[PDB]
Amino acid sequence: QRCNNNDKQALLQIKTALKNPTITDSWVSDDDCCGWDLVECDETSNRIISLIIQDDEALTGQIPPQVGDLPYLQALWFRKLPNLFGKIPEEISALKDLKSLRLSSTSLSGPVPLFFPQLTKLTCLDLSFNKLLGVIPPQLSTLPNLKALHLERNELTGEIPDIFGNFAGSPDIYLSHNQLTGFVPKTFARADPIRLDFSGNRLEGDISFLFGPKKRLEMLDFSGNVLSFNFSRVQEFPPSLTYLDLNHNQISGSLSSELAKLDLQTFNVSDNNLCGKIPTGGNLQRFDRTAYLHNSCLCGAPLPECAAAA
Numbered sequence: 001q002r003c004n005n006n007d008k009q010a011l012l013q014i015k016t017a018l019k020n021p022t023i024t025d026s027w028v029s030d031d032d033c034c035g036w037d038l039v040e041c042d043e044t045s046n047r048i049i050s051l052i053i054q055d056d057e058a059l060t061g062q063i064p065p066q067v068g069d070l071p072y073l074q075a076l077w078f079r080k081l082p083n084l085f086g087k088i089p090e091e092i093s094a095l096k097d098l099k100s101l102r103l104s105s106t107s108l109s110g111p112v113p114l115f116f117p118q119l120t121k122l123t124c125l126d127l128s129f130n131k132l133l134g135v136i137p138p139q140l141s142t143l144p145n146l147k148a149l150h151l152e153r154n155e156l157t158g159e160i161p162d163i164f165g166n167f168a169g170s171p172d173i174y175l176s177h178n179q180l181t182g183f184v185p186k187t188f189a190r191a192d193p194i195r196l197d198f199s200g201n202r203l204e205g206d207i208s209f210l211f212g213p214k215k216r217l218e219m220l221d222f223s224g225n226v227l228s229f230n231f232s233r234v235q236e237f238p239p240s241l242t243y244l245d246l247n248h249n250q251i252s253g254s255l256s257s258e259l260a261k262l263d264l265q266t267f268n269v270s271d272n273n274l275c276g277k278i279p280t281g282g283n284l285q286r287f288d289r290t291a292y293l294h295n296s297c298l299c300g301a302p303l304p305e306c307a308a309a310a
């Protein structure tokens, strides 16, 4: 045939372990498993290289450990399974060929496991919208080929490890809606990511070293933190910045007039300690007043005109 018998028996184990959910109805010992839904075989090796279990509210239990028994997996997705619980099983460490691991929108908990650096082909690592706990493993920073890391919407505490600025190739990082504390590491000055989303944490201090004219940054969201620095020290911006959200921080100083050279699509500095005139140009008078409310003394279009004598 085509379907490898060992890949076949592992899939039949996983089906059994999940209590024959409906989404595995295609998994019949009649038909070649390469034919089945949710899975993909390689063209040459004919091994299972893909398993996508998604969007099934009734599916109850843990990640079956027999996922470790599909040794040629390149993509393993468990997404939008609210009744999936327990911890990420240690067995995923034997999946040396994964490029895409997405375990997200589930009730997976415990610590972020420590074996991910060993998964050297990883390009996408998405553990987002779970109940993961404790600190970020700094050694994740050693993966050589990551494009994106999603740890957003868990229950992670502690600081951003210094070495998280040193990912080879500067992948996008999403840490938002956790309980992270301390400063953004200055190692991020040397990183060139396209997107960063650290919003809804308890981060403090400065991020001025994230901006600057040779960076390829397009999207920055640090809204809902306690950032406390003088925005006047950012006098040049990454030219392709189109999304900048800093609402709900303790940022002070004033808006550089260099902001008017950006094609900003999204812009929000509401609920800060900013002062002085909103500069004229670019898209700045195109944002409605809600991008600028709850500041100390910003004035001008679209806020009311500057009134020094009142």
Ligand SMILES: *[C@@H]1O[C@H](CO)[C@@H](O)[C@H](O)[C@H]1NC(C)=O
Binding pocket: 230, 231, 232, 233, 252, 253
């Ligand atoms: C903030 O930084 C700039 C230059 O880096 C300085 O000129 C300015 O007065 C400082 N602002 C405040 C409010 O301390």
Ligand SMILES: *[C@@H]1O[C@H](CO)[C@@H](O)[C@H](O)[C@H]1NC(C)=O
Binding pocket: 247, 267, 268, 270, 287, 288, 290, 291
């Ligand atoms: C800015 O943020 C506030 C708070 O999240 C929100 O209510 C408001 O609509 C936002 N405005 C813009 C223009 O993004």
